[PDB]
């Protein structure tokens, strides 16, 4: 699960 979550991009400002 961690690798999948770790690929998420934060939202831009």
């Amino acid at each position, epitope marked *: *699960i*961690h*690798d999948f*979550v*770790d*690929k*998420t*991009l*934060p*939202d*831009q*400002g």
Partner: antibody
Amino acid sequence: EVQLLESGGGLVKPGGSLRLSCAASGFTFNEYMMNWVRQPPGKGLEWVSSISGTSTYINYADSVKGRFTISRDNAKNSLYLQMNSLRSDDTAMYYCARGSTGGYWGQGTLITVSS
Amino acid sequence: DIVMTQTPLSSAVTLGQPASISCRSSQRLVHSDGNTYLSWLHQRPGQPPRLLIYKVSLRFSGVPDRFSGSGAGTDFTLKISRVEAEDVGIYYCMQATQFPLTFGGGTKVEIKR
């Protein structure tokens, strides 16, 4: 296992420049955002810059915008930070880190900006 | 920008007893995908930070279950159900929900012996 290792730090004069590198292995590099985070002496962690897996999205902390440039070479499994117009208060341990969770970090490299 | 206000600055805990660290976000911490991306890290002197909890409440591999995270909206908490001697050091929250990425100011845990 995942490995990240920074190089290119050291001592530089105010106004000078340095280029940091981070070599990665153990994961599919172009699938992850990569980041630079710094820790000034005696202070907490502070985000510096991020770059998405294929360089589409690049972000900088306001305090480094216009002076630092992040880039990556996916074929070389490498992340870079070009640091220009350095100031004494850029002195810090600089870490590369993978992704958005903070799970994988390099060992850090010290940048000292001093006369 | 999302400011993470982390309290307390330091906490002294008897061996085996619980500890709690709070981080409050300046605005509701919610990603466009509906989730909340906040991690808790532990750093020892001369070492990189180590991940304990990610996505608010998920434990990173190798982290013992005495560590847990929770929270929603603006209030997030790291709990240590029973402190051990090796838990000394500085803990940070980190939000990676929205740029700029931001950290709490840290909490130093001390063991009282």
